[PDB]
Design a protein around this ligand. Sequence first.
Ligand SMILES: Cc1cc2ccccc2[nH]c1=O
Length: 130
Amino acid sequence: SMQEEDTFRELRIFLRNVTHRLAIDKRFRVFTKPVDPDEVPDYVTVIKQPMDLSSVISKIDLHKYLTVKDYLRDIDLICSNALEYNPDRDPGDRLIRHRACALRDTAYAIIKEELDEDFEQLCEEIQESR
Ligand SMILES: Cc1cc2ccccc2[nH]c1=O
């Protein structure tokens, strides 16, 4: 229905706003664009499902997220990819892991404060009906 289309539109607006706030944070610059194959040639072979905040924005716009739960799976993917690809004890790896965890925690904290649980429940029930 039109009311359900309005619901998903509000969802997309909410998700774009959260994603923009993550993307403008200096700590998360490394997660804003896909990894350059020339800079890191073995990334595509190690990480089977690359994800980044520009890709998340594209997915929002392609109507790929019908719930905030599905959005958070891609945020979690950004984080887990970073922890997997940069597992070493050296400062470079520890910095990126710390930032990855901060991205995840920040996304979840914004959602905890600003997502109405009944709005999410409506989205899930529309999704489940389709
Ligand atoms: C996302 C990402 C980027 C990167 C760039 C250079 C070296 C290592 C890297 N690891 C990453 O996880």
